[PDB]
């Protein structure tokens, strides 16, 4: 639904969509060939469906063709520094395709927010108008010289590849040893105990001998650990 | 450059993008392998 949503917001105010507590299959996203760019950094794309994630965030916005390269870890550009900044380390995938079909009618709905944000922390949405800030001595009016109002407008026209609009959706994965709200479409086998079996619980992974434990977890806890912070006890997902 | 000899529209060349999912290094896939991309039916091009 998000990927083929009819309308996405402008880059200066990108909508953040939280994905949790659902089974997600990324083969469908992978399989479609309409996607111009499927670049993934933290995780190899083929293995997405296999893994389990604590949290998924979906960010959607529209940018010109030239800017897609700027939406990258540790990448410096006009739109990257001012509008939408990726942490260098973020574990996620960047998905981009043309918007000339759905947009580029001149289109002035899309705004990209220039000087008014000079340096920008990763993963915040900045919508503040800040009437005329960038650099100047007079302030706080419709004033002219060297104020130069920040939220400048993309003009999308069918004439505009490098200047053609590209819809881009950015998925950020949060990975941790916690109850993974989202996992891929993998069936569950029956449990086997007192035997050397390779196991993954809630996508935890590992090899060991599964035995029943007399130790009593507190209700919130899920994973136990040892002195060396090595996983020794787990709570079975299906049956507590 | 190959404009001088080729590119006359010249449709002779083939590149096989859609369903070639992966190839091992130094490997050629000369099987036409009509079409797969994803679904059960066959025998037509379809959508």
């Amino acid at each position, epitope marked *: 639904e998000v990927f083929n949503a009819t309308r996405f917001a402008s880059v200066y105010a990108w909508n953040r969509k939280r994905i949790s507590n659902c089974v997600a299959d990324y083969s469908v996203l992978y399989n479609s060939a309409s996607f111009s760019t499927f670049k993934c950094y933290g995780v190899s794309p083929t293995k997405l469906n296999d893994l389990c994630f604590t949290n998924v965030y979906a960010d959607s916005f529209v940018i010109r063709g030239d800017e897609v390269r700027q939406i990258a870890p540790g990448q410096t550009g006009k739109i990257a520094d001012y509008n939408y900044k990726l942490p260098d380390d973020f574990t996620g995938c960047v998905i981009a395709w043309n918007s000339n079909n759905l947009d580029s009618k001149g289109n002035y709905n899309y705004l990209y927010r220039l000087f008014r944000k000079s340096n920008l922390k990763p993963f915040e949405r900045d919508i503040s108008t800040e009437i005329y800030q960038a650099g100047s001595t007079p302030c706080n009016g419709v004033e002219g010289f060297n104020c130069y109002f920040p939220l400048q407008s993309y003009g999308f026209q069918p004439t505009n590849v490098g200047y053609q609009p590209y819809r881009v959706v950015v998925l950020s994965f949060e990975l941790l040893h916690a109850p993974a709200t989202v996992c891929g479409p993998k069936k569950s086998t029956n449990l086997v105990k007192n035997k050397c079996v390779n196991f993954n619980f809630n996508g935890l992974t590992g090899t060991g001998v599964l035995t029943e434990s007399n130790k009593k977890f507190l209700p919130f806890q899920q994973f136990g650990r040892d002195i060396a912070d090595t996983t020794d006890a787990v709570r079975d997902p299906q049956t507590l | 450059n190959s404009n001088n000899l080729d590119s006359k529209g010249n*449709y*002779n060349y*083939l590149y096989r993008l*859609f369903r070639k999912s992966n190839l091992k290094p130094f490997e050629r896939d000369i099987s036409t392998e009509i079409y797969q991309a994803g679904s059960t039916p066959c*025998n*037509g091009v*379809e*959508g």
Partner: antibody, heavy 123, light 107 residues
Framework: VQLVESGGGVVQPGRSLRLSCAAS????????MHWVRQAPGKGLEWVAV????????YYADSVKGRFTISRDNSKNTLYLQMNSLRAEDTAVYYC?????????????????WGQGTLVTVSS | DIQLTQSPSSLSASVGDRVTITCRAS??????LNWYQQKPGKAPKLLIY???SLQSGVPSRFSGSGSGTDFTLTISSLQPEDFATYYC?????????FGQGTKVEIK
């Protein structure tokens, strides 16, 4: 790209007629083929399809059993063997190839037509 | 078999008019239509493919939209050379079928 048709003309009802469609300017043996006919003063009617390799064939309902589409990947020529011809089979018959541009190539569309040949089934 | 119904089957318009040619799909095909212009005695020419993507050489006054079963062909400013019969065409599944055709006439 060229698609030159031949074989049309007047045929007595119930007899047979074969059309030809000469292909050039593109890789014939790799594109699927279609026949499309247009009866005098009426709309467009899909007729048949043959795969690139000729193993796959479909036909329209009104020509099932009688019409056979064929392929000669050596000579780059498309045929339509029309059998048990009848009055409603009188139409201007076109050959065409599948075609897809570059980007949205996943979606299969239609494209360049043969000039058409006239077949009239009348006694 | 997917059935395509165009509306209207015929229409009269004047040069410079904005005219809309509509096609309905029997079941959802969702982006797959190809629009063609056919003039009497001539072979059809592709105008719109993927139900909204313009074919090379086709002038921009032809524009397409839609998804699912709801689709239109729109001419922003009709030209005298645009008076012809237009067919929508579905490509979701086999066999491929056409709309009944919309004839654009002079008012």
């Amino acid at each position: 790209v060229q698609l030159v048709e031949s074989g049309g003309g007047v045929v007595q009802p119930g007899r047979s007629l074969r059309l030809s469609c000469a292909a050039s300017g593109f890789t014939f043996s790799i594109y699927g083929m279609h026949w499309v006919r247009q009866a005098p003063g009426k709309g467009l009617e899909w007729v048949a399809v043959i795969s690139y390799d000729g193993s796959n064939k479909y036909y329209a309902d009104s020509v099932k059993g009688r019409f056979t589409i064929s392929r000669d990947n050596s000579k780059n020529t498309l045929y339509l063997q029309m059998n048990s011809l009848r009055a409603e089979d009188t139409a201007v018959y076109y050959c065409a190839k599948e075609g897809r541009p570059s980007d949205i190539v996943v979606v299969v569309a239609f494209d360049y037509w043969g000039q058409g040949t006239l077949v009239t089934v009348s006694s | 078999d997917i059935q395509l119904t165009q509306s209207p089957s015929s229409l009269s318009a004047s040069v410079g008019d904005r005219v809309t040619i509509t096609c309905r799909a029997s079941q959802s095909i969702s982006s797959y239509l190809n629009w063609y212009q056919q003039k009497p005695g001539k072979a059809p020419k592709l105008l719109i493919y993927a139900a909204s993507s313009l074919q090379s050489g086709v002038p921009s006054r032809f524009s397409g939209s839609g998804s699912g079963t709801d689709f239109t062909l729109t001419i922003s400013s009709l030209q005298p050379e645009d008076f012809a019969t237009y067919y929508c065409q579905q490509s979701y599944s086999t066999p491929r079928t056409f709309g009944q055709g919309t004839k654009v006439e002079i008012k």
